[PDB]
Design an enzyme around this catalytic site. Sequence first.
Site, PDB file in Angstrom:
ATOM      1  N   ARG A  85       0.836  -1.190   0.000  1.00  0.00           N
ATOM      2  CA  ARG A  85       0.000   0.000   0.000  1.00  0.00           C
ATOM      3  C   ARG A  85       0.876   1.246   0.000  1.00  0.00           C
ATOM      4  NH1 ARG A  85      -1.845   0.835   4.252  1.00  0.00           N
ATOM      5  NH2 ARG A  85      -1.379  -0.976   5.576  1.00  0.00           N
ATOM      6  N   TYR A 233      -0.578  -4.245  -6.841  1.00  0.00           N
ATOM      7  CA  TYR A 233      -0.517  -4.887  -5.529  1.00  0.00           C
ATOM      8  C   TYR A 233      -1.900  -4.962  -4.901  1.00  0.00           C
ATOM      9  CZ  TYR A 233       0.030  -5.449  -0.440  1.00  0.00           C
ATOM     10  OH  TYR A 233      -0.098  -5.864   0.881  1.00  0.00           O
ATOM     11  N   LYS A 242      -9.695  -3.438   1.073  1.00  0.00           N
ATOM     12  CA  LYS A 242      -9.442  -2.235   1.864  1.00  0.00           C
ATOM     13  C   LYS A 242     -10.299  -1.065   1.387  1.00  0.00           C
ATOM     14  CE  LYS A 242      -6.300  -4.371   4.261  1.00  0.00           C
ATOM     15  NZ  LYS A 242      -6.506  -4.561   5.763  1.00  0.00           N
ATOM     16  N   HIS A 262     -10.988  -3.150  11.069  1.00  0.00           N
ATOM     17  CA  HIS A 262      -9.800  -3.900  10.662  1.00  0.00           C
ATOM     18  C   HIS A 262      -9.519  -4.975  11.720  1.00  0.00           C
ATOM     19  CE1 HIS A 262      -5.239  -3.761   9.471  1.00  0.00           C
ATOM     20  NE2 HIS A 262      -5.877  -4.727   8.836  1.00  0.00           N
ATOM     21  N   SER A 284      -1.614  -3.417  10.484  1.00  0.00           N
ATOM     22  CA  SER A 284      -1.152  -4.328   9.443  1.00  0.00           C
ATOM     23  C   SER A 284       0.176  -4.964   9.839  1.00  0.00           C
ATOM     24  CB  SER A 284      -1.010  -3.596   8.111  1.00  0.00           C
ATOM     25  OG  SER A 284      -2.082  -2.700   7.897  1.00  0.00           O
ATOM     26  N   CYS A 286       0.718  -7.152  12.206  1.00  0.00           N
ATOM     27  CA  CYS A 286       0.916  -7.200  13.653  1.00  0.00           C
ATOM     28  C   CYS A 286       0.263  -8.407  14.330  1.00  0.00           C
ATOM     29  CB  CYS A 286       0.426  -5.895  14.290  1.00  0.00           C
ATOM     30  SG  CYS A 286       1.613  -4.530  14.061  1.00  0.00           S
ATOM     31  N   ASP A 309      -9.144 -10.407   8.831  1.00  0.00           N
ATOM     32  CA  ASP A 309      -8.713  -9.056   8.467  1.00  0.00           C
ATOM     33  C   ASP A 309      -9.814  -7.996   8.518  1.00  0.00           C
ATOM     34  OD1 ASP A 309      -6.362  -7.383   7.373  1.00  0.00           O
ATOM     35  OD2 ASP A 309      -7.784  -7.121   5.741  1.00  0.00           O
ATOM     36  N   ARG A 403       2.912 -12.250  -0.088  1.00  0.00           N
ATOM     37  CA  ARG A 403       1.599 -12.661   0.384  1.00  0.00           C
ATOM     38  C   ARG A 403       1.210 -13.984  -0.247  1.00  0.00           C
ATOM     39  NH1 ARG A 403      -1.387  -9.107   4.322  1.00  0.00           N
ATOM     40  NH2 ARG A 403       0.025  -7.313   4.399  1.00  0.00           N
TER      41      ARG A 403
HETATM   42  N1  LIG Z   1       6.843 -12.360  18.072  1.00  0.00           N
HETATM   43  C1  LIG Z   1       5.647 -12.609  17.544  1.00  0.00           C
HETATM   44  N2  LIG Z   1       5.435 -12.405  16.196  1.00  0.00           N
HETATM   45  C2  LIG Z   1       4.217 -12.650  15.642  1.00  0.00           C
HETATM   46  C3  LIG Z   1       3.179 -13.104  16.458  1.00  0.00           C
HETATM   47  N3  LIG Z   1       2.078 -13.270  15.684  1.00  0.00           N
HETATM   48  C4  LIG Z   1       2.399 -12.943  14.410  1.00  0.00           C
HETATM   49  N4  LIG Z   1       3.715 -12.550  14.361  1.00  0.00           N
HETATM   50  C5  LIG Z   1       4.426 -12.145  13.117  1.00  0.00           C
HETATM   51  O1  LIG Z   1       3.983 -10.913  12.588  1.00  0.00           O
HETATM   52  C6  LIG Z   1       3.911 -10.922  11.164  1.00  0.00           C
HETATM   53  C7  LIG Z   1       2.538 -10.410  10.721  1.00  0.00           C
HETATM   54  O2  LIG Z   1       1.592 -11.335  11.211  1.00  0.00           O
HETATM   55  P1  LIG Z   1       0.126 -11.450  10.558  1.00  0.00           P
HETATM   56  O3  LIG Z   1      -0.796 -12.346  11.343  1.00  0.00           O
HETATM   57  O4  LIG Z   1       0.255 -11.858   9.109  1.00  0.00           O
HETATM   58  O5  LIG Z   1      -0.242  -9.863  10.491  1.00  0.00           O
HETATM   59  P2  LIG Z   1      -1.708  -9.325  10.172  1.00  0.00           P
HETATM   60  O6  LIG Z   1      -2.232  -8.597  11.427  1.00  0.00           O
HETATM   61  O7  LIG Z   1      -2.664 -10.444   9.870  1.00  0.00           O
HETATM   62  O8  LIG Z   1      -1.384  -8.263   9.013  1.00  0.00           O
HETATM   63  P3  LIG Z   1      -2.296  -7.821   7.751  1.00  0.00           P
HETATM   64  O9  LIG Z   1      -2.730  -9.003   6.925  1.00  0.00           O
HETATM   65  O10 LIG Z   1      -1.319  -7.013   6.936  1.00  0.00           O
HETATM   66  O11 LIG Z   1      -3.532  -7.033   8.188  1.00  0.00           O
HETATM   67  C8  LIG Z   1       4.109 -12.362  10.724  1.00  0.00           C
HETATM   68  O12 LIG Z   1       5.345 -12.528  10.064  1.00  0.00           O
HETATM   69  C9  LIG Z   1       4.120 -13.163  12.015  1.00  0.00           C
HETATM   70  O13 LIG Z   1       5.065 -14.211  11.923  1.00  0.00           O
HETATM   71  C10 LIG Z   1       3.389 -13.308  17.819  1.00  0.00           C
HETATM   72  O14 LIG Z   1       2.476 -13.716  18.541  1.00  0.00           O
HETATM   73  N5  LIG Z   1       4.627 -13.052  18.362  1.00  0.00           N
HETATM   74  O1  LIG Z   2      -2.125  -4.079   4.907  1.00  0.00           O
HETATM   75  C1  LIG Z   2      -2.991  -4.785   5.403  1.00  0.00           C
HETATM   76  O2  LIG Z   2      -3.540  -4.606   6.596  1.00  0.00           O
HETATM   77  C2  LIG Z   2      -3.532  -6.009   4.641  1.00  0.00           C
HETATM   78  O3  LIG Z   2      -3.047  -6.156   3.423  1.00  0.00           O
HETATM   79  O4  LIG Z   2      -4.371  -6.734   5.161  1.00  0.00           O
HETATM   80 MN   LIG Z   3      -3.582 -10.815   7.831  1.00  0.00          MN
HETATM   81 MN   LIG Z   4      -5.067  -5.885   7.034  1.00  0.00          MN
END
Ligand SMILES: Nc1nc2c(ncn2[C@@H]2O[C@H](COP(=O)(O)OP(=O)(O)OP(=O)(O)O)[C@@H](O)[C@H]2O)c(=O)[nH]1
Ligand SMILES: O=C([O-])C(=O)[O-]
Ligand SMILES: [Mn+2]
Ligand SMILES: [Mn+2]
EC number: 4.1.1.32
Length: 620
Positions: A85, A233, A242, A262, A284, A286, A309, A403
């Site tokens: 983004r 993307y 989004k 979100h 995002s 996190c 999401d 992704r």
């Molecule tokens: N240290 C730690 N890292 C984590 C944890 N959970 C997720 N991560 C890492 O954080 C990164 C993002 O995690 P996601 O679950 O894909 O993030 P998301 O909130 O779904 O992000 P978006 O899809 O972009 O909205 C990944 O590479 C995970 O490996 C956790 O509990 N502890």
């Molecule tokens: O960026 C973000 O939060 C996604 O792609 O879900």
């Molecule tokens: Mn996600």
């Molecule tokens: Mn997201």
Amino acid sequence: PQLHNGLDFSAKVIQGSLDSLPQEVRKFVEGNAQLCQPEYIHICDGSEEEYGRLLAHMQEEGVIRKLKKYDNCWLALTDPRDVARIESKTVIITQEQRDTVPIPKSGQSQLGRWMSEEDFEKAFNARFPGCMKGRTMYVIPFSMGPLGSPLAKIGIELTDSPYVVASMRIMTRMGTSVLEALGDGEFIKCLHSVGCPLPLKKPLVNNWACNPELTLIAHLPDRREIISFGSGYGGNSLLGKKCFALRIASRLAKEEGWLAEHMLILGITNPEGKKKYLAAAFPSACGKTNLAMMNPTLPGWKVECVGDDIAWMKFDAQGNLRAINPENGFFGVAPGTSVKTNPNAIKTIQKNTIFTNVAETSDGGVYWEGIDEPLAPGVTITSWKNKEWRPQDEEPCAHPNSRFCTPASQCPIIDPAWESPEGVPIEGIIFGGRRPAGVPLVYEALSWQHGVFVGAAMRSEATAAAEHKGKVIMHDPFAMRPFFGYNFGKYLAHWLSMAHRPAAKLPKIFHVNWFRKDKNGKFLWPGFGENSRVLEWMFGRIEGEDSAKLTPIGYVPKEDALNLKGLGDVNVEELFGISKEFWEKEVEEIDKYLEDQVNADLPYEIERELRALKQRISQM
Ligand SMILES: Nc1nc2c(ncn2[C@@H]2O[C@H](COP(=O)(O)OP(=O)(O)OP(=O)(O)O)[C@@H](O)[C@H]2O)c(=O)[nH]1
Ligand SMILES: O=C([O-])C(=O)[O-]
Ligand SMILES: [Mn+2]
Ligand SMILES: [Mn+2]
Ligand SMILES: [Mn+2]
């Protein structure tokens, strides 16, 4: 009729019939066909045959590669300028700026980017005329939410990219049956172009058509239009996600009395046979996908995934806050996904899945940082840059925001109610972000008003989901900073108003931090499946267990209230340490931010919670 040929694009339709479209849909396709000048028009039907033809097409044009190790999986590699983004090129057009963002006190607004209708006209006319010359315009009918459901919202996306078509088939409910449900009702108008009319003036990188200089993702809530130019993307080109389901929908939700957020939605069942649903807003990259699909380490506990999401939520007649997931797949971050961190993701992505910007192994598989799996002798790796890659360079083999795009119905723990048009009842809401210092593992809000303030106060290390570098600590209220469809001050008042609804069963609000670090720089909490230990505490608190202790920032678990067995070595003092020095600086930064950025639109109840927090900390 016309006076010449003019405006009848029937002769250019290579699948479908303009005559079979609803009148307003036909005007939308034909008006933009006349403007963008596509060579062909393809009206999508969503069928398996059509998907196969699109995939075969894209493979013949060098746009994707088959991953021969897995079942119907494909790899796409992008131009390195088109990887995430771009918040600075994402805009919302309203007559009045105050409808989009609060007028800041001193600086520029970080709560959105407003553009005047007159300025957008000049930008549109400089980009879209003739932009699809020599290309096919695909017409994507899609539903956000279960098809035929009354709470679903239907859109039509026009695009010149087969990659967008294939991904929309996974991430939405798409094709002919959607047109039949739409009839002559309202739809969201979505217009996309990669912005690369043929013949090419500029050669393409990795065969990836994009126009970074002219990239602009615009939203026009009054016209129910989303117009996106120059980027492929997913966050910029999959307009149902989004752009529609957060930005446009959050304004519709304000007008109609619901919420578009979100957030993940999960169901958790305990050893006593009781199940509750929870929602969680993290920024995002996190942790939402890893929490929503978690494999719990505690025996007798089970997590099921409703969505990872986006959540659409509304109080029902009985006072329950009910949520649906409007998406049809997961568009998740690949790096860090492994058998140990997210085994349920690993099982999901081994078939019918499109990967973008991960590495390919020579035996036809995928690779990325943190995959945690050794390769057999002789197996070699090609990076996302389409280069030979050795594990002793400096470039990672997969882009940090690469992704997978995978169907939700394939997830082994997909919740049985995930397509239930009535939604699932939410009993708790979780906030959190990346805070390496000061913020404890979990606390609980004191009231609805304090909980809204906790969401408003969220801060988090920047990630690779957008253009922000430096890992600096940024404000991201409700995890929605890049996604507000309207004035954030009005959004706070909308949230606060929910406590005025009759018989409203307001959920408990929690804030977590999986990311606290010690003086060494390593995480204090193992996270992933171990986060089940935190969810157990939240479950008990929702049932009314006397397991909390009162602190200046909220309730935290009493000593021995958390199941820490099997960890043992966990430093509990540092994980729940509340320092007065840290929190005095934290409230100052929240004060300055709210005063500048929300200014005259800050609700009094939020200012009152800020004052109360400041007083409680001062008494430490
Ligand atoms: N240290 C730690 N890292 C984590 C944890 N959970 C997720 N991560 C890492 O954080 C990164 C993002 O995690 P996601 O679950 O894909 O993030 P998301 O909130 O779904 O992000 P978006 O899809 O972009 O909205 C990944 O590479 C995970 O490996 C956790 O509990 N502890
Ligand atoms: O960026 C973000 O939060 C996604 O792609 O879900
Ligand atoms: Mn996600
Ligand atoms: Mn997201
Ligand atoms: Mn009130």
